[PDB]
Design a protein around this nucleic acid. Structure first.
Lengths: 94, 79, 158, 47, 137, 119
RNA sequence: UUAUUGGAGGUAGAGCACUGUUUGGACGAGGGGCCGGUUACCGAAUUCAGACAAACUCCGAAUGCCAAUUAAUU
RNA sequence: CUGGGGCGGUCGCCUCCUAAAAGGUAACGGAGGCGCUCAAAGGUUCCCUCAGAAUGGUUGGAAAUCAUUCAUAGAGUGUAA
RNA sequence: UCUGGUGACUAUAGCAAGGAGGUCACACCUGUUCCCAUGCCGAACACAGAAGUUAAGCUCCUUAGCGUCGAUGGUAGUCGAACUUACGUUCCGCUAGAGUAGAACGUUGCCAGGC
């Protein structure tokens, strides 16, 4: 399991988030052990791919900038209409 | 022939705050009208028979918390 | 089996409380006065009548109407009185067991019952027009219910 | 429940008016009040 | 049919219908359910009508849950009288559904039978619906 | 089980209820008292600043004797009287703590009264 | 009128801690099937999950309002 | 007065919601009260702390009374909110 | 530095659990003769003493078990603007409630005694 990420720069307005979601991209955040909070973005279909393979409770090799961080998916918001994930939280696991 | 049994109300009482936080007041100025004590009297502030809060000296008004979930008003002298 | 770390840590009987009972008097004010006299004759502490704490539905009761009486025997004289009374009533009871096996509410309560039988053992209440059941309660200054039963087992019948 | 008039024996005027329940208090009521002619408290009695 | 045993007030203001569904947006008791996609009132005659239609097609095989209850009374005047001499008398009980609210849930049958029974029930309701399954992922 | 209550903690409730309109103000400073099973302490306090100004007690080596205890209260009262007499021997207010004004605290207060203080 | 600063107040939204309404499932106490008890069934309590409110609230905005500054425009 | 008029209802005062987080705000809009009472149910100084739930126990209407623990006003506060 | 008295602070201070301490304090503790007192009980209050005890209250160390506090990111709602009559859409500011990471088994003033 290996997901790659991109760092979101400061202060996305709501139109930016809307365009971002109109792609296959998902806003997310990473926080926890040995790390400071970083706002990132992730592709939706690849995330579904790796989650269908590692399971709901599994470890991911998320790549953030130059680092790579073992991480676990803490929570996620989901739109019941439109059937699409809309936000994910990532938790560094030490 | 139908009618209603509801038709009545009482006149409104003009309760609530009467002076502002940070404003200068004179001796017996009314600061707050209420039923019961939603706000308690603090320093240099009295409480009337109808629970009215009023100043006892000249000074400036200060609303401020009392405990975890209570409030009070005070008046401080120099101004 | 005591194993007291210090003499200060030793379970002892805290106090004894005996209540006159219901004494519900619709027209038995004189009977209530007689029961007060009887309670005063039994133990050597001034008997204090009780009163209602609520208004029972479908009952001749309101807020007041002194239906009851309680006395608090905890002094050395009261302790000796209770001990001699228990020793005497043990003969007049005429029961093999004597007391229920599970009397404590877990905290160590006696909650013993009385049905006017051993009552007035000193002076036969031939003048009595009713029965005087009692409710003696013993206060255990001990946390463990089993240990409290074991302590009350000394000089006791259950 | 009626009105009553308390009267000062020496003052010579009736300057205290109060109320009473005739059923609970069929008697005439007395209390000492201040008379601003003697400059002191004196006993007042219902008429 | 379904109506509360007692309420504090018999004459209430009418609910707000704009917005999106506040809660109850997921299947939690069974395995299939009917999701609403438009907004309306459901009138407690429609609920019984749709439940009878849905429960007889399954031949008393599975279980049904109704995630909706009519809590609100609405009034109506007698036959077309003049305007305004007091509020009218109670006539029915309604529940307000907004897009995203699950309405029914079934379990204990095949996916095919569930699809058919929920389709049958959805034709008795004044709202557009959609067959959904218990979420995962 | 019978549970006996801590007596000192019950005292502080009564003391806080008493100590609502009674406060020291640097002209009338509060005279507090704390009694134990063996000793009696005293203190003059100005609540407006939260600072104390004088202090006396029975366990002090100055007043050391085997008076019953009430005479010890009398002498500590007369003692804090002079220590406050050094400055601002004027009106004060008496904070009886939570104790019933009787016996020992009463003796302390009467001693302080009959010795110059103006409460 | 705006910037900055301080304050009073319970709407939208949310939530179920109280007062009411409600759907499933447990747990046990009771009546109760029987021959007193099994089981059923029935009602009450505590729990787990999930819902509703103009006259519910553990929470709680955006705005609007009251003020004060050798502030800036008018 | 009045969703024409009549018939029916209503007319002064108090509390709540409508009322859109200051105050104010209508309809024959939605709910209730008042036309008093108290000689202490007023003043002051001292004390004190509940309902309820749980387990026991003669009478036990299940609960009256008694004992222990928990128990934030759920008690109580003359009279509506 | 320890203990005590007395203040200030929204429980980050509380409740629960485990473990240790005493003649320097404090408390349990002895008794009811006296001041005083208990609708009865020296239980409580009050007074008189120091025999015992750290058992308890209390004080110190451990734990995040319940309670309390609590971001970032996202979402709801909404001032203004622009389309529109859609149980609406778009842009721009402000920005919850719930939930997650996490904090937390108090901080501090004055006095006395002991150090």
């Amino acid at each position: 399991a290996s997901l790659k990420s991109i760092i979101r720069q400061g202060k996305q307005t709501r139109s930016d988030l809307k365009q971002l979601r109109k792609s296959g991209k998902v806003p997310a955040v990473v926080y926890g052990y040995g790390t400071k909070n970083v706002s990132v973005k992730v592709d939706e279909v690849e995330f579904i791919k790796v989650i269908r393979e590692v399971g709901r409770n599994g470890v991911i090799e998320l790549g953030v900038g130059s680092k790579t961080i073992k991480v676990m998916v803490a929570d996620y918001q989901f739109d019941p209409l439109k059937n699409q994930i809309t936000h994910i939280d990532f938790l560094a696991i030490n | 022939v139908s009618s209603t049994k509801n038709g009545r109300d009482s006149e409104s009482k003009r309760l609530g705050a009467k002076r502002a936080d940070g404003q200068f007041v004179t001796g017996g100025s009314i600061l707050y009208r209420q039923r019961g004590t939603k706000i308690y009297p603090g320093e240099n502030v009295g409480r009337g028979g109808d629970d009215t809060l009023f100043a006892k000296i000249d000074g400036v008004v200060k609303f401020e918390r009392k405990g975890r979930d209570k409030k009070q008003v005070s008046v401080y002298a120099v101004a | 089996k005591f194993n007291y770390s210090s003499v200060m840590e030793v379970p002892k009987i805290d106090k004894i409380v005996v209540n006159m009972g219901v004494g519900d008097a619709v027209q038995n004010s004189k009977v209530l006065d007689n029961a007060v006299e009887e309670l005063e004759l039994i133990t050597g502490q001034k008997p204090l009548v009780t009163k209602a704490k609520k208004s029972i539905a479908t009952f001749r009761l309101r807020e007041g109407m002194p239906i009851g009486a309680k006395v608090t025997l905890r002094g050395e004289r009261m302790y000796e009185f209770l001990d001699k009374l228990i020793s005497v009533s043990l003969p007049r009871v005429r029961d093999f067991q004597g007391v229920s096996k599970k009397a404590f509410d877990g905290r160590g309560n006696y909650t013993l019952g009385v049905k006017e039988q051993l009552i007035f053992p000193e002076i036969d209440y031939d003048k009595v027009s009713k029965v005087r059941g009692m409710d003696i309660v013993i206060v255990t200054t001990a946390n463990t219910d089993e240990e409290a039963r074991e302590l009350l087992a000394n000089f006791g019948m259950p | 429940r009626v009105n009553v008039t308390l009267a000062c024996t020496e003052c010579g005027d009736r300057n205290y008016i109060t109320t009473k329940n005739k059923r609970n208090n069929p008697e005439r009521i007395e209390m000492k009040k201040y008379c601003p002619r003697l400059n002191k408290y004196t006993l007042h009695r219902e008429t | 049919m379904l109506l509360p045993k007692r309420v504090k007030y018999r004459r209430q203001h009418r609910p707000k219908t704009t917005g999106r569904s506040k809660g109850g947006n997921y299947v939690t008791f069974g395995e299939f359910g009917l999701q609403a996609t438009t907004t309306s009132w459901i009138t407690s005659r429609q609920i019984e009508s749709a439940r009878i239609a849905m429960t007889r097609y399954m031949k008393r095989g599975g279980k049904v849950w109704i995630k909706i209850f009519p809590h609100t009374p609405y009034t109506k005047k007698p036959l077309e009288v003049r305007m305004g001499a007091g509020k009218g008398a109670v006539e029915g009980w309604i529940a307000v559904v907004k897009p995203g609210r699950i309405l029914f849930e079934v379990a204990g049958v095949s996916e095919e039978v569930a699809r058919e029974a929920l389709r049958l029930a959805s034709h008795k309701l004044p709202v557009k619906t959609k067959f959904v399954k218990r979420e995962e992922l | 089980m019978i549970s006996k209550i801590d007596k000192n903690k019950v005292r502080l409730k009564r003391h806080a209820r008493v100590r609502t309109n009674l406060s020291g103000t640097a002209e009338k400073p509060r005279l507090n008292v704390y009694r134990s099973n063996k000793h009696i302490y005293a203190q003059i306090i100005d609540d407006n600043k939260g600072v104390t100004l004088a202090q006396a007690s029975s366990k002090d080596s100055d007043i050391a004797t085997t008076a019953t205890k009430v005479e010890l209260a009398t002498k500590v009262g007369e003692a804090i009287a002079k220590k406050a007499a050094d400055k601002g021997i004027k009106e004060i207010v008496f904070d009886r703590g939570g104790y019933l004004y009787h016996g020992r605290v009463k003796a302390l207060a009467e001693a302080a009264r009959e010795s110059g203080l103006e409460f």
